[PDB]
Design a protein around this ligand. Structure first.
Ligand code: PLM
Ligand code: PLM
Ligand code: PLM
Ligand code: PLM
Lengths: 316, 39, 102, 51, 51, 51
């Protein structure tokens, strides 16, 4: 993988019409070219110009330096690779569009020529007409599918190459984008071919494009836990979070949610990370430490959970 | 529209309910279990 | 003129369904107008903040701020809650007590 | 409120819901306003040995 | 084997299964052969009092 | 003998991934033959326009 890897009278009438057809062809050619240039450019120019400039900056710095450092150097090279891949996939997709459109353009121009010049006769028109109608059914879904895929990829553009996306609960990395399919890597790096015609109807998450993300730690305590210990728990958590501001934002909430029987109080801690979740492993490492801190606080404050007592009657 | 605020207010009500149950001595108990011992 | 019109008919046959979708999305955004930017909406139980509205898609943030892109062609068929536009809301605290409680 | 394309409802907790008529029209709809006096049920259980 | 209208697969127990391509065309398909080295997970639990 | 048996095994292993192409060829050919019949009927002038 790229990511995640370890009778001159009639002769002249003919000629005149041939010239006209040729001009029509050139016109359409010009239209075709223009639309592809617009699509190809705007796709990237209005979305990641700034990432390109950041990449150039860091490489200028590396060249200068040559005349957690290593971690930084690696990140710089991995980001450059991601931009190169996005750039190459876009060029490829546009070239594929170019072939589809060029081919239809050529075919229609042949037909136009044959009919405007008078070469095709009545029987040929009838047969061509039928062939087009039949083709309209056969290739009907195909043409629709490609069109929708184009809109999804270039207009909606929910994700780029290298972004970590969420589809139906599956956190996956985008490896490659094409017109008919998107290729994703699952958390275990299984490669998945996912048709765009399906992807077009789903709600797609994108961690890469997200602002700093939040999280939750749910827990339970005994119903008899004094309100003072609940207050101490809130205070201890605040102190922890404030001593680790490289990982956590100061804002957090402790929510008391439910009293079950008279035995259990359900609670949840809401926190805010200083990162989005593109680096999933880092998210889990930071959360893991917070969970162990909660463990420690409960032990120090003597916060417990007991089961309801059971009354027993003994017969002999 | 503001969920954090909604939950703060709700949490205080949940803790008040806790307090009331304790002050009024309101409890829940499991059904008694009869045991027959055959040694 | 005839040939041009003939091809428009064929194009309609083939791509009319995608045009239909775009149009329906336009009606959703400008006529039905269930939400604005900054409102918290509920879609399938998910409480999400609307960040951006477009013709083909709506961008929302989930409670953990994950950014999510919904096609408008899908939102058009869902019932959408909107907290911003709601009157003062209510709530419930469920609990249980012993049968023998006086 | 009622409109041609969508019906607006309030839930028990008063959130406001926009519900397209294109989906609503294919559902069975109860109406308590138009209903006659309604009934109810209390379910319970007792021991087998209860005389 | 692969054909135009159908794909034939063997399940883990070697049952031979015939899928219409018309349904595979709408599925997300994993491919291990083409995958990079894969990862895994071992889940477990310990007592809360473990130091 | 091992060399010839391995050669056969390899030729089959390679041919097994081309079965879809062979099927497409048959389909395309059938279409092509029909198209040529129609062309013959038209270019020689043997067919008339009502038919
Ligand atoms: C259905 C008509 C063709 C569509 C236009 C050309 C192909 C568009 C790109 C889709 C991916 C095909 C190329 C990559 C195949 C591979 O994975 O090796
Ligand atoms: C009747 C349809 C013909 C036009 C086909 C082009 C696609 C519709 C117009 C796209 C408008 C931009 C949509 C929002 C893109 C975005 O999410 O940023
Ligand atoms: C495809 C055209 C759709 C427009 C035709 C229907 C006119 C709108 C129907 C009511 C729903 C929108 C509510 C707008 C507020 C109002 O005018 O009361
Ligand atoms: C020639 C038109 C026949 C109609 C069916 C369309 C596909 C062309 C025939 C190729 C065989 C398809 C695969 C079937 C399994 C097999 O061949 O054993």
């Amino acid at each position: 993988s790229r990511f995640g890897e370890p009778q001159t009278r009639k002769i002249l009438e003919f000629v005149t019409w041939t010239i006209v057809t040729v001009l029509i062809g050139a016109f359409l050619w010009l239209v075709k070219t223009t639309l592809l240039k617009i699509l190809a450019s705007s796709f990237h120019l209005n979305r990641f110009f700034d990432r390109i400039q950041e990449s150039v900056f860091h490489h200028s710095v590396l060249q200068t330096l040559a005349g957690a450092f290593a971690k930084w150097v690696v990140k710089v090279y991995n980001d450059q690779a991601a931009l190169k891949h996005a750039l190459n996939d876009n060029k490829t997709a546009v070239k594929q569009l170019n072939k589809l459109v060029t081919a239809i353009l050529i075919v229609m121009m042949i037909v136009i020529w044959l009919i405007v010049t008078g070469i095709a006769t009545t029987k040929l028109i009838v047969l061509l007409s039928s062939q087009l109608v039949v083709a309209a059914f056969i290739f009907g879904n195909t043409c629709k599918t490609i069109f929708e895929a184009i809109i999804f990829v270039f207009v909606m553009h929910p994700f780029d190459v290298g972004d970590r996306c969420v589809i139906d609960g599956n956190k996956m990395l985008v490896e490659e984008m094409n017109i008919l399919t998107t290729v994703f890597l699952k958390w275990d790096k299984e490669k998945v071919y996912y048709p765009n015609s399906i992807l077009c109807t789903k709600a797609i998450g994108n961690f890469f494009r997200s602002p700093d993300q939040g999280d939750v730690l749910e827990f339970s305590v005994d119903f008899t836990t004094p309100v003072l210990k609940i207050g101490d728990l809130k205070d201890r958590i605040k102190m922890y979070l404030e001593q680790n501001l490289n990982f956590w934002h100061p804002q957090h909430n402790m929510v008391v949610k439910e009293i079950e029987n008279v035995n259990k109080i359900k609670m949840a801690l809401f926190v805010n990370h200083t990162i989005n979740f593109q680096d999933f492993a880092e998210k889990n490492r930071r959360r893991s430490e917070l969970v162990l801190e909660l463990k420690k606080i409960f032990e120090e404050l003597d916060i417990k959970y007991n089961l309801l007592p059971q009354e027993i009657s003994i017969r002999n």
